[PDB]
Amino acid sequence: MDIAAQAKLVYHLNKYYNEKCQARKAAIAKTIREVCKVVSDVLKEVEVQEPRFISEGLEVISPTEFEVVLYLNQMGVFNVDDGSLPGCAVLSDGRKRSMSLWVEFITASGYLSARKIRSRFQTLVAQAVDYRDVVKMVADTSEVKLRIRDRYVVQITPAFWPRSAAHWPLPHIPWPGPNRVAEVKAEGFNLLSKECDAWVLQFAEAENRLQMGGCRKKCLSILKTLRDRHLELPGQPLNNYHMKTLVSYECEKHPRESDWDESCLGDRLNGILLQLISCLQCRRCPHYFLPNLDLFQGKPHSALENAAKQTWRLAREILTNPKSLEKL
């Protein structure tokens, strides 16, 4: 009897993925196509004032929030991760300051300033917005953020293998195979100009590729969707990034690709919600690549607890009656 309920769960989850998850990616695509015209148009204007800025590398934060990473024409004339500041990193010799496309922006100390490029970029964006009612500029934040049609918020973050991520993959876990490891590692990493004077690290390119195989993406698509529909809560305790970062952890716990067959979608999804409820209750949720930073950092105890209540309540309605997914 325990066999048939596993299959019923996998069936209704596939319906959720095809009915509700696809609808998400459809509404998001409508919202992104509307948003992306505004940004690329504005970015075209920034290109005429500053040609170094140019118009793929997108990030969905929520259905209404996005982060555009703008990959700048670089020279990489500058060569550095230390325990100094967690999750964030920062030239070689006192020569070749004139080698950078952004040569003016290297500091007197000889370091290259994220704070200064983002300000220069922010001044340009706030100026380009002056269009009437459809675009707004977000202030009191160091990062560039636009408010479009008073409905959506888009952050535009200037952007281009690390010391903390060096352990991964630990040869302990058969996953990933040497083929998947070197393949995902070739993606490299990205540095995002955000506050913490440092650059934020992001592996959205490696993370999303690491989860290739099996139902991992269907699981993420289902997790992101459930979060949108039922876990947008006071305190914004839960992000698409929380789900994304958990799916990777569950990949380790179940190393074998067989654990990720389509038959196992219910198990892996159920396993992930539970680990999430633990993270909420334990009050700690670590980054996949960098354990030193906790993605619950700064979250109120009241909100982390309530999120645990709703996440738990959600998994039970699912298991007791998996058809309940239709009405979710």
CA separation for the pair 103, 322 (Å, rounded): 59
Q: How far is CA 214 from the centre of its chain?
A: 21
Binding site per annotation, positions: 24-25, 56-58, 65, 67, 217, 221-224
- Angle of the 240-253 helix axis to the 265-282 helix axis, nearest 10: 120
- In a shared domain, residues 222 and 317: yes
In terms of domains, do 238 and 130 share one?
no
Residue at a domain's end among 212, 227, 252: 212
**CA-to-CA distance for 3 and 33, rounded, in angstroms?**
43
| Domain shared by 64 and 8, yes or no | no
Q: Do 48 and 175 share a structural domain?
A: yes
Residues 120 and 229 in one domain: no
Residues 175 and 222 in one domain: no
Inter-CA distances, 268 with 80, 219, 248, 272, 274, Å: 37, 8, 11, 6, 10
Is the same domain home to 235 and 282? yes
Measured at the CA of 169, the angle between CA 225 and CA 159, to 5 degrees, comes to 60
- Number of domains within the chain: 2
Q: Does residue 162 sit in the same domain as residue 218?
A: no
Contact 253, 271 (CB under 8 A): yes
The answer on 182 and 43 residing in a single domain is yes
Q: Are strands 135-137 and 88-89 parallel, antiparallel or unpaired?
A: unpaired
Which range of residues forms the domain containing residue 79? Answer: 23-212
Residue whose structure tokens are 């695509």? 29
- Residues at the binding site for a ribonucleoside 5'-triphosphate are 24-25, 56-58, 217, 221-224
Exposed, middle or buried: residue 256 (CB in 10 Å: 0-12, 13-18, 19+)? Answer: exposed
Residue in the block written with tokens 């500091």: 107
Clarify whether residues 90 and 190 are in a common domain. yes
Tokens of 205: 């390119």
Pair (119, 255) in one structural domain? no
Q: Provide the β-strand partners of residue 70.
A: 158
Resolution for this experimental structure (Å)? 3.0
Binding residues for Mg(2+), as ranges, are 65, 67
First to last CA, the chain: 25
Residues 15 and 82 grouped into a single domain: no
Using an 8 Å Cβ cutoff, are 285 and 296 in contact? yes
Structural domain ending residue among the three candidates 153, 182, 212: 212
Q: Which residue, 212, 229, 252, sits at the end of a domain?
A: 212
Is-contact 55 158, C-beta < 8 A? Answer: no
